[PDB]
């Protein structure tokens, strides 16, 4: 659904060609996401290679440690890279102290 929304956005609001062109979940393989812990301000880029039938997010131990997570009960987020690139803005962030948490102010490539 998120990829369909991004394709609709690109075709209608901006007048550019579609990017994902997916009809089944297996058409998202090879596309990039962003992982973000609920207490950090930096993200890390990952790649989709498969799907399982469980309610967990499997990943390398280095991937979970780069988000300062411990893997004994924690829960994190994933979002499509293009969605965050097009939609994220620093002008929608709340003005209290805890407003810059959970925000990808920078991403790590390696």
């Amino acid at each position: 659904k998120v990829a369909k929304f991004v394709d609709d956005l690109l075709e209608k609001f901006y007048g550019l060609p579609r990017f994902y062109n997916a009809e089944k979940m297996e058409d998202l393989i090879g596309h990039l996401v962003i992982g973000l812990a609920p207490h950090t301000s930096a993200g890390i880029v990952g790649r989709i290679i498969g799907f399982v039938d469980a309610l967990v997010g499997y990943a390398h131990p280095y991937f979970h440690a780069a988000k300062r997570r411990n893997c004994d009960g924690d829960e994190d987020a994933v979002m499509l890279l293009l969605d965050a690139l097009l939609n994220f803005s620093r002008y929608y962030l709340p003005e209290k102290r805890g407003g810059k948490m959970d925000a990808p102010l920078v991403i790590t490539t390696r």
Binding site: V52, D53, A54, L55, Y58
Partner: protein, 165 residues
Amino acid sequence: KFTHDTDDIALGPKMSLYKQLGDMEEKVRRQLEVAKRIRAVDEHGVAEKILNSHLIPDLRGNLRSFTRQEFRCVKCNTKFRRPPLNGKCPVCGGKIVLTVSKGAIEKYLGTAKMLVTEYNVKNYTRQRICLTERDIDSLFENVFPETQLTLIVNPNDICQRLVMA
């Protein structure tokens, strides 16, 4: 490298049974059955007691917030620390509602009484539960009088048995 291999990485149950039980009594009954089956758990006296030390805080902590609570309007969000003495919201025409209802105190009383009567708990917890019930039924003595009689009584309760013993 790794030490142990696996046939499938996502083999087994996929959803917890805890997410398919609706009532609290049903959850407690299923959990106690599970504890009874397992040989090395010893439910009968530690599981139910340590569980009772989770419903007792709820009961005692909701009766102490009923006697010091703030009222609120349905249409507005205004909160009054004491009820308006005309019975209506001063700044509008809506009616006032409680923030801690009467049914919030005694939602876990039935399960607690079942736990007390069925299993072996120390007399401290049993007396605490009996006195909690007596205190719940005594705060509303002159707002909800018992004007309804009954045909059949004595459903094998435990509080009256403890009192008469």
